């Protein structure tokens, strides 16, 4: 039993033609791609793997000229109809045929697989089971998102997308993979994986666990009539003189700092101790409000770690306190 | 060449260097005393030259002195979360030394990419400018208030230890039961069969009786395994 990006069994695979005037359109890439092509005249000649396919960014190329295999990863300038008529980096060189290929890109590596089963059914994909050996591996590592094929122009091909399923592979004696079961294909197959045997005899078998997913979410907190009196402090008709700074104690109420924050009539909403956004979130036991009147220069003067007339003579602010000075 | 390369890129865009298919000796790296920090997590440093690795990645970048501690498994910091993140489990070594010699001329070439990346997956390089993102209501201009453009610049001056530039290179090893592209400088002995011998093939290790096998591997395969997934058959590296 192994878990890997496999083609789900009995899946839908797009079937593009090389007939009547036809084309080879660009298809999205994915965690992996299944490419199976049926041939009588060996028409299919290529692949492309690029993010852009327009020479802006690196684009891997695979092309088979008559007896040579070519791999390049430059920023090629591809034609809008890239077809083969009848900052550069690494390079490599070397229907009766069904040349299946699995092109997967993982962990910065680009892996290719292959098989060449001969077929007599020209209509569609043959029922059967051929495993795919790893043809070549090469460490390209590109943020590949797209995919296009190159056809020899004077042979339909299929495209399927791999998924992260779990499969049970039945290795034979000499090592060929002869059968496999897709553990999530159908409830019968879930049993075969759990039993770890291909034949499942009469009886009832426990396989998996049902679950009900939590649908919504709730966060709660009790409403309270203990609203902060900050508005009363700011809107008091008369404040006392600066020398007699009235100290008002605040407790046992919920404080809407945000409403203060959103209100903009206050000319200066200076804060040192705590960022005003966190004020609503963060909660303390003791809140003290001081009220008094001064000139504009003194509004500057009333700040922590500062020496001045109002700053020192009548109302002093320690460097350390967590608080905000609001003047309008 | 990488360790004593003349220039390394800034941290926000760290170059990734792939090492494979070469014999690598780490005694040379170990022996030099210029290296301020040689901290290794997955593997003890002395044993590096002995072992075989499936893959080696070399990452190079320049950071201030205070940030070197942040380049660690499961470490949280300004540069760690935003710029270069190590998986908690990664098997590798961290190599750091001062850059006041080669840099710190004010030096503004080096950029370290602030708020614009808030949480970052391990081992990706993020170079996107993202003009002014971090947090704001207006967007997509040279705009001011509370946008505060991400790629802020290190200023390196000889005045700047904690603020001195430190070149750091991080080696990540990939370890697996596969053909190890890179191995240490160990000679090969002759093969002995039908006898109880302690053996390591391609750095595989183990003790057993080496016998010729009638079983026929497929060309790509290298290691066989048993029902219990216990290594029973191997393909000799030198002679197939």
């Amino acid at each position, epitope marked *: 039993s192994t878990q890997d990006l496999f083609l789900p069994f009995f899946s839908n695979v797009t079937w593009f033609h090389a007939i009547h005037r036809f084309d080879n359109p660009v298809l999205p890439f994915n965690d992996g791609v299944y490419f199976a092509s049926t041939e009588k005249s060996n028409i299919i000649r290529g692949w492309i793997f690029g993010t852009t396919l327009d020479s802006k960014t690196q684009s891997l190329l695979i092309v088979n000229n008559a007896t040579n295999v070519v791999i390049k990863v430059c920023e090629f300038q591809f034609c809008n109809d890239p077809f083969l008529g009848v900052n550069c980096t690494f390079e490599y060189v070397s229907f009766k045929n069904l040349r299946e290929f699995v092109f997967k890109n993982i962990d910065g590596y680009f892996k290719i697989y292959s098989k060449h089963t001969p077929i007599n059914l020209v209509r569609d994909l043959p029922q059967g089971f051929s495993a795919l050996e790893p043809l070549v591996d090469l460490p390209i590592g590109i943020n590949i998102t797209r995919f296009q094929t190159l056809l020899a122009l004077h042979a339909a091909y299929y495209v399927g997308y791999l998924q992260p399923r779990t499969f049970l592979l039945k290795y034979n004696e000499n090592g060929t993979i002869t059968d496999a079961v897709d553990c999530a294909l159908d409830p019968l197959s879930e049993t075969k994986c759990t039993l770890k045997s291909f034949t499942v005899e009469k009886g009832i078998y426990q396989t998996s666990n049902f679950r009900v997913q939590p649908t919504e979410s709730i966060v709660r907190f009790p409403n309270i009539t203990n609203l902060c009196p900050f508005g009363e402090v700011f809107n008091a008709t008369r404040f006392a003189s600066v020398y007699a700074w009235n100290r008002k104690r605040i407790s046992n109420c919920v404080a809407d700092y945000s409403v203060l924050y959103n209100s903009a009539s206050f000319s200066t*909403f200076k804060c040192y101790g705590v960022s005003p956004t966190k004020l609503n979130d963060l909660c303390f036991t003791n809140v003290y409000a001081d009220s008094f009147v001064i000139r504009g220069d003194e509004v*500057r003067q009333i700040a922590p770690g500062q020496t001045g007339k109002i700053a020192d003579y009548n109302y002093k602010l320690p460097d350390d306190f967590t608080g905000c000075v609001i003047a309008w | 060449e990488v360790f004593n390369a003349t220039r390394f890129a800034s941290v926000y865009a760290w170059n990734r260097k792939r090492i494979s298919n070469c014999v690598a000796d780490y005694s040379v790296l170990y022996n030099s005393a210029s290296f301020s920090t040689f901290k290794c997590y997955g593997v003890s440093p002395t044993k590096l030259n002995d072992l075989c690795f499936t893959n080696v990645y070399a990452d190079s970048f320049v950071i201030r002195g205070d940030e070197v501690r942040q380049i660690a498994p499961g470490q949280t910091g300004k540069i760690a979360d935003y710029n270069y993140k190590l998986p908690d489990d990664f098997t590798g070594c961290v190599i750091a030394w001062n850059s006041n010699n080669l840099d710190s001329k004010g030096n503004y070439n080096y*950029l370290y990419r602030l708020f614009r990346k808030s949480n970052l997956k391990p081992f990706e390089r993020d170079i996107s*400018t993202e003009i002014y993102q971090a947090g704001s209501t207006p967007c997509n201009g*040279v705009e001011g208030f509370n946008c*505060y453009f991400p790629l802020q610049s290190y200023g390196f001056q000889p005045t700047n230890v904690g603020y001195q530039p430190y070149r750091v290179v991080v080696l990540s090893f990939e370890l697996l039961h596969a053909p190890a592209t890179v191995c240490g400088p160990k000679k090969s002995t002759n093969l002995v069969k039908n006898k109880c011998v302690n053996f390591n093939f391609n750095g595989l290790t183990g003790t057993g009786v080496l016998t010729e096998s009638n079983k026929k591997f497929l060309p790509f395969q290298q290691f066989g395994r048993d029902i219990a997934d216990t290594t029973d058959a191997v393909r000799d590296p030198q002679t197939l």
Partner: antibody
Amino acid sequence: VQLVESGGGVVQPGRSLRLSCAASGFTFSIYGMHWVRQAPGKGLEWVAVISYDGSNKYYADSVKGRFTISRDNSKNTLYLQMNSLRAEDTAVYYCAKEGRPSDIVVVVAFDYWGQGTLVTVSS
Amino acid sequence: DIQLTQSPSSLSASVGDRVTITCRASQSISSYLNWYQQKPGKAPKLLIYAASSLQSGVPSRFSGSGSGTDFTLTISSLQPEDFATYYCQQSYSTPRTFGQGTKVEIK
């Protein structure tokens, strides 16, 4: 870090001129660039700003339509294309770089200046 | 547009005096002034940014403070080289603007 300005001289009213500011000593392509002008004996007047990539360009009230700012990140050079010049445009023009001194990066600030070049619009 | 008005436009004082220059904004920009020192015939030099942070290389006597709309530039004890024209400058939004300038002369 150096900002070399040029392109000044005498221009008749109504003609055009291109100012240049060559950047060195820092990574130019990542910073906004500003033009600031100072009329003779007068105060500073912000002129135009361009984003790092040149996609965003804003101009002051007095120069909308007439002034065009441009950028060459390959040569690390800043340009200011001034058109339909008039008597009031006579000023010593500075190129300037965004900059931010420490971690209060939420300040996005103003910094090192070029030497400034004199432009005289006169017949 | 955000308008920044400096007051006084000029003032005379002697070396060692404590000076105060105020810049008031038409709207709250809440931390986004920048204070520069300009000498005649040369480009300005940045002094205080975010209205309260001292820029490297500028003497510690220079100080700025305030947020919102009321801001102050202060030099604790004047020296002969500090007699100059000082401009406030907002960065809250575009277009960026300057104050009209404050000239400090010798008494």
